[PDB]
Homo-oligomer: A and B are copies of this chain.
Amino acid sequence: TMQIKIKYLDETQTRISKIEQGDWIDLRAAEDVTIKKDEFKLVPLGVAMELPEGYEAHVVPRSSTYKNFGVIQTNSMGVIDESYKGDNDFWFFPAYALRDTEIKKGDRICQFRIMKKMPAVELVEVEHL
C-alpha cells in the first residue's frame, strides 16, 4: 500500500492512523473555534502530510457537518498538492457560518481522499475550434 507521512501540530491532536480500505478519512479541529453568523474562519486541522508522489488530496465537509455546525466550505473542495509537504504545511477547513456556531477541539469537521493528479497536457491555441 501507499505511504502518507503525517505530522501532528502537537501531542493533543487525535492520531488518525488505522487500516484503510479506500474510504475517505475524517479530519478534526485542532482547537475550539467560535464563528458568528456570516463570518468566516479557517478551522485548523492539526495535521501536515507528505502525500504520495504524483497525487493530490481533496477535502470536503462531512455529510452531517451542516446540521451539526451550520457551516459551509467556502472553497467548495480544497485541493492539497503533493508539494504541500513541509514541516509547517498544516491543513485547514475554510468555514463560513450561516448561524452562530462553535466547533470543539477534536470534532470531525471534514473528510479527504487522495487522487492521482491529472496527466501532462499541452494547451495549444487555435483561432477556431
Knowing A94-B63, A113-B118 touch, does A128 contact B38 (C-beta < 8 A)? no
Copies of this chain held together in the complex:
3
A2 contact set on B, CB distance < 8 A: 119-122
Please, which residues of chain B bring their CB within 8 A of the CB of A115?
118
1/0 per residue, CB under 8 A from B, across A100-129: the answer is 000000000001011101111111111111
Q: Counting CB contacts under 8 A, is A79 at the interface? A: yes
Residues of chain A from 1 to 54 with CB closer than 8 A to chain B in the complex: 1-8, 15-17, 19-25, 38, 40, 48-50, 52, 54
Could you list some 11 contacts between A and B, CB below 8 A?
A2-B120, A5-B126, A7-B125, A20-B120, A21-B121, A22-B118, A23-B81, A50-B129, A63-B78, A72-B74, A73-B76
